[PDB]
Write a protein that binds this DNA or RNA. Structure first.
Ligand SMILES: [Mg+2]
Ligand SMILES: [Mg+2]
Ligand SMILES: [Mg+2]
Ligand SMILES: [Mg+2]
Ligand SMILES: [Mg+2]
Ligand SMILES: [Mg+2]
Ligand SMILES: [Mg+2]
Ligand SMILES: [Mg+2]
Ligand SMILES: [Mg+2]
Ligand SMILES: [Mg+2]
Ligand SMILES: [Mg+2]
Ligand SMILES: [Mg+2]
Ligand SMILES: [Mg+2]
Ligand SMILES: [Mg+2]
Ligand SMILES: [Mg+2]
Lengths: 56, 100, 88, 65, 271, 129
RNA sequence: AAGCUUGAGUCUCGUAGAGGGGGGUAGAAUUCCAGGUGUAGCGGUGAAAUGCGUAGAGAUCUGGAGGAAUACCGGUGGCGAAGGCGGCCCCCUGGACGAAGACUGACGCUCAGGUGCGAAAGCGUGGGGAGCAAACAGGAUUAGAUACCCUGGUAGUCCACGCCGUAAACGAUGUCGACUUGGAGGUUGUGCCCUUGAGGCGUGGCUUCCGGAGCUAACGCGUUAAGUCGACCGCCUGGGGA
């Protein structure tokens, strides 16, 4: 998320925008996922669990 | 004789040399009595990411209906010729004639 | 795989007065031709297992058809194998 | 809401840059069918087109490189 | 291909026959054949120079063409033949004007293959061309070090050399050992691998086969007497001495490259 | 495979009885038709009708007397896996007479009781109550 | 002996597909090699130490070299007999499914033995080797720590042609064929009616959840049954021993 600062715009606002962009990307989450190797089976199980949760 | 969508990129300095190349290619497909559907040259376009070191590339689009042999020959030529960087050879279906 | 024109030709060769299109003999012939076509592929691509299974199934079907023909009427069965080059 | 269905097209082409850029984010990452409201085959086609563009360097893999 | 023999005799047991049925059975070509006199590891001073050499079947020389000077002419493969001179196979090639030549057999080559030597030659295994026309990346055999000198690199069976860099006058070739070295782009080099990859799968089987090959038996220093070899002597088996040649030079790592000439052209040593 | 048609028909009938269906449609046969006729005679069903030239379809109208199914239990004893043949005196009496057995009798397919009356045995198809 | 189409097939147009096998190639990222800038620490954990680093590491920019896997799309998404299969593109090719129709006429089902396929790990020669990582080493931790944790690190993981033939190979539900109130959907098509607009009529194939009848020891399954029948097999007969 390459972010540039506009004229007539505060630093805090820019920071907030950057944060939003990051959130949109889901980079941190991806990193977390990749931090340790996941077995395919485990991933599948997780997905299934998520699907189950979705149903309410 | 099968439908073949081919879009290829050429070296920025080799844009002057490609009209001849285009004609050669045309001749090649005419040799095996294949069909040429459309040709669109997008010209020197700034790449989204630079390949090797070049930032601008000469884009050429071409739609063909030809036997396998000439396609293979084309591929070989591409592999050999460093002026044309890479090509996207593709299978298509029915008469595709219109660009843009 | 197998050309439409080729199939038509096969039908013309085998089926009675060309009006028939789903004849048993015709089907057998079609199966045989495709096997022959695919034999080279098999020789080349030795580990292609899914594809192999398909032709095995086809082969089985062909065999079944042949068996059906055999007890139904022998002579026509024999004739079919003669032009085909099928062993038994 | 699927735009492709509304349009009534056979194939989504990699030629049209303006349509494809609407379906990816700024960083160079594809937007899901669940957010956009797209049909699945159409989504797949779109993805393929995007990939083709990336290969041709029409639309980037990553925005920082 | 590779034939595991049925172990009838204890000799025939492990013998793995490398069998190429594509090879021509009978007489090799006459004018391209010459005398190969066996020396038995002895030099001008008649002394054994290189141990464990000599004997076996009488060998005849093949004038295999490594220079390839007939540019712009297509060459069609007449018939592939056996070579006792080298580990690699040889192909007799018919020329369009009218010439036979012995060339080193490429991997993707049988009987009746059209190849070309020179600059204008296209991409095909067996074609010989200067490296300044070659695309960098591919696998190459029968490689010259100097322009017009003669092919010296990758002439053993199954071998190949990948191209890694293009820097104008020089081109870096990553050798079979892994040692990257810069060669001039003007030198001739034949595209593809050598046409006997399975040669390494061969097992000689018995001492007899070794003898036929032309290799005399090899006595271990540790067996020899302390006069004969540094590793000599000892009541029973004793070795308490660092492994060395018959001449007392360490033979477990002691590097001996001191060429100092072509060392500038060497990019990176092997792993 | 479509191995037993009669059994299939019986199953369909049972299903109809369970799910309170007014009319059950099924592929038809001559023996099947005869069986249906026999059933009608016995009083289990309203009316049967076969319709179809190339693909014959037997339609069966079922009774549900006093808010409950008339055909309570309907099961084959003779089967494609195991055929049961019975002698004249060996013929069963299903649920002490209050209930019947479909028998393939050589003088026309009928009830076990009827067969007994005649003096003839055969294959005991189904047990109907 | 003679026949039929609905079963089972084949032909016409299509339908999507991580269905295979073979060949190319793309990107990022890690590792390493080389160089440039740079200086006091880096790396790791619960905290530390081993490690790496005053030889200049980490950091970081450029140039490469490679090996492998394909982020995002991606979804109880899809396809396959299963095992499984996800970058992209070509070649070869299997199958499925459907729509109108045409034709063959039971060609059907299952399968003892038999044959083929069969994750992983392993084994075999030959390759290839970036990461990861059994074993292995050191550090910790610990009463002890042959572990969990860290730093490392060989086989292996990757290909080539073979062997192996086992998995909780699991829908823990044999395979096929038939029938029985439903819904919410999703997925994949397709044909009419003025599509008068994304849509409407219904109406066929495919998969997911809830659940009626029913069933069961209940849990639950539930038109993809574990329901109502039929065929056919396969297997069980207390646990341990095994
Ligand atoms: Mg020696
Ligand atoms: Mg020795
Ligand atoms: Mg001695
Ligand atoms: Mg001495
Ligand atoms: Mg001793
Ligand atoms: Mg000692
Ligand atoms: Mg007929
Ligand atoms: Mg394995
Ligand atoms: Mg191995
Ligand atoms: Mg560890
Ligand atoms: Mg330890
Ligand atoms: Mg087992
Ligand atoms: Mg499994
Ligand atoms: Mg089991
Ligand atoms: Mg439920």
């Amino acid at each position: 998320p390459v972010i540039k600062v506009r004229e007539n715009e505060p630093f805090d606002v820019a920071l907030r925008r950057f944060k939003r962009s990051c959130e949109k990307a889901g980079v941190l989450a991806e990193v977390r996922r990749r931090e340790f190797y996941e077995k395919p089976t485990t991933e599948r199980k997780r997905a299934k669990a998520s699907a189950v949760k979705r149903h309410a | 004789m099968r439908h073949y969508e081919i879009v290829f990129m050429v070296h920025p300095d080799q844009s002057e040399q490609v009209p001849g190349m285009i004609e050669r290619y045309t001749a090649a497909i005419t040799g095996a009595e294949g069909k040429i559907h459309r040709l669109e040259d997008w010209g020197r376009r700034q790449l989204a990411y630079p390949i090797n070191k070049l930032h601008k590339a000469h884009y050429v689009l071409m739609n063909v209906e030809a036997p396998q042999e000439v396609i293979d020959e084309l591929e070989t030529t591409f592999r050999f010729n460093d002026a044309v960087i890479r090509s996207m050879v593709m299978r298509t279906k029915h008469a595709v004639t219109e660009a843009s | 795989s197998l050309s439409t024109e080729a199939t038509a030709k096969i039908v013309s060769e085998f089926g009675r007065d060309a009006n028939d299109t789903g004849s048993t003999e015709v089907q057998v012939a079609l199966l045989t031709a495709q096997i022959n076509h695919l034999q080279g592929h098999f020789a080349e691509h030795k580990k292609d297992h899914h594809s192999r299974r398909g032709l095995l199934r086809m082969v089985s079907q062909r065999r079944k058809l042949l068996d059906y023909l055999k007890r139904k009427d022998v002579a026509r069965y024999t004739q079919l194998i003669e032009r085909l080059g099928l062993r038994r | 809401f699927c735009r492709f269905t509304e349009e009534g097209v056979q194939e989504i082409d990699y030629k049209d840059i303006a349509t494809l850029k609407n379906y990816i984010t700024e960083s160079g990452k594809i937007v899901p069918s669940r957010i956009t409201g797209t049909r699945a085959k159409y989504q797949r086609q779109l993805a393929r087109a995007i990939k083709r563009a990336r290969y041709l360097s029409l639309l980037p893999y990553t925005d920082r490189h | 291909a590779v034939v595991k023999c049925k172990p009838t005799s204890p000799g025939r047991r492990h013998v793995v026959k490398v069998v190429n049925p594509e090879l021509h059975k009978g007489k090799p070509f006459a004018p391209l054949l010459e005398k190969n006199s066996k020396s038995g590891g002895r030099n001008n001073n008649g002394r054994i120079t290189t141990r464990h050499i000599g004997g076996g079947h009488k060998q005849a020389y093949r004038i295999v063409d490594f220079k390839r000077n007939k540019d712009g002419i297509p060459a069609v493969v007449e018939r592939l033949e056996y070579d006792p001179n080298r580990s690699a196979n040889i192909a007799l090639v018919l020329y369009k004007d009218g010439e036979r030549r012995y060339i080193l057999a490429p991997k993707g080559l049988k009987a009746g293959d059209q190849i070309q030597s020179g600059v204008d030659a296209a991409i095909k295994p067996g074609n010989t061309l200067p490296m300044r026309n070659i695309p960098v990346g591919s696998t190459v055999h029968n490689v010259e070090m100097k322009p017009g000198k003669g092919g010296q690199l990758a002439r053993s069976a199954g071998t190949y050399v990948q191209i890694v860099a293009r820097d104008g006058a020089y081109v870096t070739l990553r050798l079979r050992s892994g040692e990257m070295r810069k060669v001039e782009a003007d030198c001739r080099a034949t595209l593809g691998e050598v046409g006997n990859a399975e040669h390494m799968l061969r097992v000689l089987g018995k001492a007899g086969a070794a003898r036929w090959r032309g290799v005399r038996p090899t006595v271990r220093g540790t067996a020899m007497n302390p006069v004969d070899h540094p590793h000599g002597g000892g009541e029973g088996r004793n070795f308490g001495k660092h492994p060395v040649t018959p001449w007392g030079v360490q033979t477990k790592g002691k590097k001996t490259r001191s060429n100092k000439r072509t060392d500038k052209f060497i990019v990176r040593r092997r792993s | 495979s479509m191995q037993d048609p009669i059994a299939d028909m019986l199953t369909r009938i049972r299903n109809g009885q369970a799910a309170n269906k007014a009319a059950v449609t099924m592929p038809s046969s001559k023996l099947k038709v005869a069986i249906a006729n026999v059933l009608k005679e016995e009083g289990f069903i309203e009316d049967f009708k076969v319709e179809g030239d190339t693909k014959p379809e037997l339609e069966l109208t079922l009774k549900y007397f006093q808010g409950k199914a008339v055909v309570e239990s309907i099961q084959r004893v003779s089967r494609p896996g195991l055929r049961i043949y019975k002698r004249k005196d060996e013929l069963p009496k299903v649920m002490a007479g209050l209930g019947i057995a479909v028998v393939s009798t050589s003088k026309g397919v009928m009830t076990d009781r009827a067969a007994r009356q005649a003096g003839l045995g055969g294959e005991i198809i189904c047990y109907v109550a």
